[PDB]
Amino acid sequence: KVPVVGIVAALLPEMGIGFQGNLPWRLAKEMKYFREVTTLTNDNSKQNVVIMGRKTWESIPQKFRPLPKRINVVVSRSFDGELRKVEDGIYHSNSLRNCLTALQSSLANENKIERIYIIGGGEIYRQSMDLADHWLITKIMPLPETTIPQMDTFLQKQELEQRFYDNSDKLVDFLPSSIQLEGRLTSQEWNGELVKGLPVQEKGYQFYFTLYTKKLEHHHHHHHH
Numbered sequence: 001k002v003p004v005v006g007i008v009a010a011l012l013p014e015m016g017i018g019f020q021g022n023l024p025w026r027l028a029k030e031m032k033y034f035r036e037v038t039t040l041t042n043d044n045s046k047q048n049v050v051i052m053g054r055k056t057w058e059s060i061p062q063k064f065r066p067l068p069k070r071i072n073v074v075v076s077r078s079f080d081g082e083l084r085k086v087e088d089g090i091y092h093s094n095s096l097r098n099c100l101t102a103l104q105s106s107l108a109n110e111n112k113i114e115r116i117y118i119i120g121g122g123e124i125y126r127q128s129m130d131l132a133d134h135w136l137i138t139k140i141m142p143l144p145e146t147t148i149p150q151m152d153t154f155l156q157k158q159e160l161e162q163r164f165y166d167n168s169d170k171l172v173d174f175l176p177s178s179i180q181l182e183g184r185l186t187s188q189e190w191n192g193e194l195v196k197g198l199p200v201q202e203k204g205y206q207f208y209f210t211l212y213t214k215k216l217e218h219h220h221h222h223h224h225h
């Protein structure tokens with residue numbers, strides 16, 4: 001019942017997202033977007049959840065975690081079970097899939113979660129293509145004089161574009177209504193792919209905020225008792 005949204009920043013065209021356990025760039029406007037999207041809600045009585053893998057959590061600066069004003073969930077196979085409060089703001093789960101089931105329980109959640117955002121890292125996003133309802137992808141491109149950074153972790157773009165379509169016409173309506181974005185919706189070709197979304201530039205990069213949404217599915221079966 002709650003939407004599940006993966007949110008990630010990726011460098012085109014290979015959709016690289018990390019190198020040596022860290023992000024391959026430091027873009028304050030891209031961090032601000034991620035902060036505002038995952039923190040803000042349309043209903044001020046609700047919060048969103050951020051779910052992340054153990055190596056993502058260990059990479060977030062200590063003074064900045066758990067991420068404020070969001071319920072944080074960290075997943076590790078060494079943890080005890082599907083969704084356990086361990087500290088204020090912090091839940092631990094030994095299962096991405098079972099934590100999503102647990103968070104979706106209206107009895108547990110009192111209908112006070114608005115969205116669940118899956119915020120990384122590579123291993124977790126690999127497993128999320130069949131769990132997410134939408135992806136919010138910041139597509140990053142180096143500007144012509146900018147050196148492409150080294151990267152070692154990538155979003156699965158094949159499986160992205162099998163299952164989801166570029167729905168960026170609807171991004172501004174999908175984001176919580178109090179966010180305010182600088183760009184207007186723009187379509188630009190870049191190395192032969194269409195990049196569509198809300199543009200910004202920072203340091204040596206241009207990047208677009210984009211929305212992908214699941215493709216329509218045929219009706220093959222519905223379970224009957």
Ligand SMILES: NC(=O)C1=CN([C@@H]2O[C@H](COP(=O)(O)OP(=O)(O)OC[C@H]3O[C@@H](n4cnc5c(N)ncnc54)[C@H](OP(=O)(O)O)[C@@H]3O)[C@@H](O)[C@H]2O)C=CC1
Pocket residue numbers: 007008009010016017018019020021022023024052053054055056057059075076077078093094095096097119120121122123124125127153
């Ligand atoms: N550009 C961006 O938007 C982002 C980039 N990143 C980048 O991604 C990289 C980190 O990715 P990665 O190394 O893949 O690691 P992850 O952050 O994906 O963490 C992987 C760990 O999560 C646990 N885990 C994985 N699947 C499950 C599951 N189904 N259930 C319970 N636990 C599970 C395991 O923990 P354990 O070993 O303890 O069992 C595993 O080692 C860094 O470079 C980081 O900067 C991260 C977030 C955002």
Ligand SMILES: CCc1nc(N)nc(N)c1C#CCc1cc(OC)ccc1OC
Pocket residue numbers: 007008009022023030031034056059060061064067118119120136137138
């Ligand atoms: C890097 C900011 C970001 N952007 C988008 N679009 N999606 C995301 N999932 C993230 C992220 C993240 C986690 C994070 C937070 C942080 O300081 C608050 C530092 C590092 C982070 O992840 C490696």
